[PDB]
Design an enzyme around this catalytic site. Structure first.
Site, short mmCIF file in Angstrom:
data_model
loop_
_atom_site.label_atom_id
_atom_site.label_comp_id
_atom_site.label_asym_id
_atom_site.label_seq_id
_atom_site.Cartn_x
_atom_site.Cartn_y
_atom_site.Cartn_z
N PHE A 208 0.87 -1.18 0.00
CA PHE A 208 0.00 0.00 0.00
C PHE A 208 0.90 1.22 0.00
CE2 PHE A 208 -3.16 2.99 1.73
CZ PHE A 208 -4.23 2.71 0.95
N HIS A 211 0.52 7.60 1.98
CA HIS A 211 -0.74 8.28 2.21
C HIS A 211 -0.71 8.94 3.57
CE1 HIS A 211 -1.22 4.50 4.33
NE2 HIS A 211 -2.20 5.06 5.03
N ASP A 213 -3.70 9.54 6.66
CA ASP A 213 -4.93 8.86 7.03
C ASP A 213 -6.13 9.80 6.96
OD1 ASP A 213 -3.61 6.52 7.47
OD2 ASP A 213 -3.89 6.50 9.63
N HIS A 267 2.80 7.72 5.54
CA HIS A 267 3.29 6.38 5.82
C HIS A 267 2.84 5.44 4.72
CE1 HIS A 267 -0.63 6.83 7.73
NE2 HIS A 267 -0.80 5.52 7.63
C1 LIG Z 1 -2.02 0.98 7.42
C2 LIG Z 1 -3.20 0.13 7.88
C3 LIG Z 1 -4.15 0.96 8.73
C4 LIG Z 1 -3.93 -0.49 6.67
N1 LIG Z 1 -4.33 0.52 5.70
C5 LIG Z 1 -5.57 1.01 5.68
O1 LIG Z 1 -6.48 0.59 6.40
C6 LIG Z 1 -5.84 2.14 4.68
C7 LIG Z 1 -4.79 3.21 4.89
S1 LIG Z 1 -4.89 4.00 6.51
N2 LIG Z 1 -7.16 2.66 4.95
C8 LIG Z 1 -8.10 2.77 4.02
O2 LIG Z 1 -7.96 2.33 2.88
C9 LIG Z 1 -9.36 3.46 4.44
C10 LIG Z 1 -10.46 2.49 4.83
C11 LIG Z 1 -11.70 3.22 5.37
C12 LIG Z 1 -12.86 2.29 5.66
N3 LIG Z 1 -13.20 1.50 4.52
C13 LIG Z 1 -14.03 3.12 6.19
O3 LIG Z 1 -15.07 3.08 5.42
O4 LIG Z 1 -13.95 3.74 7.23
C14 LIG Z 1 -3.08 -1.54 5.97
O5 LIG Z 1 -2.52 -2.39 6.80
O6 LIG Z 1 -2.99 -1.59 4.75
FE LIG Z 2 -2.76 4.75 7.07
#
Ligand SMILES: CC(C)[C@@H](NC(=O)[C@H](CS)NC(=O)CCC[C@H](N)C(=O)O)C(=O)O
Ligand SMILES: [Fe+3]
Ligand SMILES: CC(O)(O)C(F)(F)F
Length: 328
Positions: A208, A211, A213, A267
């Protein structure tokens, strides 16, 4: 790769009534937020081993049939009401990660925001109780356990910013929080498809990309497998794993409110060929919540930023993150 400075902060005073002890925690949160932007909350009171046990039982039990039946609309056009909540499928050969997202359990069919069809509010979908005994009950209780930790952390952030301890938490309420839990499964795959591996500009293999958050703060449990990196002035630095603590960082709503005094750290997630769990709780406020931006570096505390309602921030942010880093 440099090891990132990610202090372990004992947050247990934030659950109690010792105001001076709470201010000493707040100072540690201030320091971490001004440095790399990450810390581990320890002595947080949550049973994370049981969280991992129950999540593993779910991820290892769920069937391809159930995944379609629970899928968000990005994977299943029949489910037009499921934008956020439900199953996010893997694409073998192309996309390795899969996950299950749920929202506030109080978003029931009779909830006024569900009745109104207000964006970002949905009724959770769950697998069949007979196939996943106890899972829904465990997951809903987990929501309230991590809600409680997050409320405590928000008292610490408020005190850290020179505010009264309720400054954020008064907008973080069981009846209307837009907070979400995501139960992410990162698989071991042999062979691991290259199409499911991204490459950073510096050559690092990623699951990933970089980005900030979409959250006020993010409250994360992960397996004991190192994977996260944070951008600092010295480059990307590795965040050590700690499957006993919660990894805490600010999201871009906090950066907005504090005029970047507490930045939302950039991150990314390294590619690791390992079966592991990543279980974030995104601390979101209510749809109409609006905190006047301020600046703790300025004498009068005034900011040249405009107020932004949390619902506006969230709806726009989640779409933007999908467009930037892809549909998870
Ligand atoms: C870095 C972690 C938090 C995780 N990444 C993630 O969860 C990534 C980046 S923070 N987050 C997202 O894509 C947003 C999801 C939001 C969720 N569907 C909602 O509707 O509220 C990973 O392990 O990939
Ligand atoms: Fe994140
Ligand atoms: C789930 C877990 O691996 O953390 C343990 F140790 F509880 F089994």
């Amino acid at each position: 790769v440099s090891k990132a400075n990610v202090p372990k902060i004992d947050v247990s005073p934030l659950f109690g009534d010792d105001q001076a002890a709470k201010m000493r925690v707040a100072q540690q949160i201030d320091a971490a937020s001004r440095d790399t932007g990450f810390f581990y909350a320890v002595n947080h009171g949550i049973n994370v081993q049981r969280l991992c046990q129950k999540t593993k039982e779910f991820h290892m039990s769920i069937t391809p049939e159930e995944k379609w039946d629970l899928a968000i609309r990005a994977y299943n056009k029949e489910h037009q009401d499921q934008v956020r909540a439900g199953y996010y499928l893997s694409i073998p050969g192309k996309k390795a990660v899969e996950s299950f997202c749920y929202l506030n359990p109080n978003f029931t069919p009779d909830h006024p925001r569900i009745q109104a069809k207000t964006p970002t509010h949905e009724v959770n979908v769950w697998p069949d109780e007979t196939k996943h005994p106890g899972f829904q009950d465990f997951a809903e209780q987990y929501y309230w356990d991590v809600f409680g930790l997050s409320s405590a952390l928000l008292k610490g952030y408020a005190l850290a910013l020179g505010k009264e301890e309720n400054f954020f938490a008064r907008h973080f309420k069981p009846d209307d929080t837009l907070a979400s839990v995501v139960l992410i499964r990162y698989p071991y795959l042999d062979p691991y498809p290259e199409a499911a591996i991204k490459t950073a500009a510096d050559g690092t293999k990623l699951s990933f990309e970089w980005h900030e958050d979409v959250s006020l703060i993010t409250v994360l449990y992960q397996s004991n497998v190192q994977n996260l990196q944070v951008e600092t002035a010295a480059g990307y630095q590795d965040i050590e794993a700690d499957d006993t603590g919660y990894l805490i960082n600010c999201g871009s709503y906090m950066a907005h409110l504090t005029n970047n005094y507490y930045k939302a750290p950039i991150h990314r997630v390294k590619w690791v060929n390992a079966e592991r769990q990543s279980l974030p709780f995104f601390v979101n406020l209510g749809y109409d919540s609006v905190i006047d931006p301020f600046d703790p570096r300025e004498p009068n505390g005034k900011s040249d930023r405009e107020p932004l309602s949390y619902g506006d921030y969230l709806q726009n942010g989640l779409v933007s993150l999908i467009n930037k880093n892809g549909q998870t």
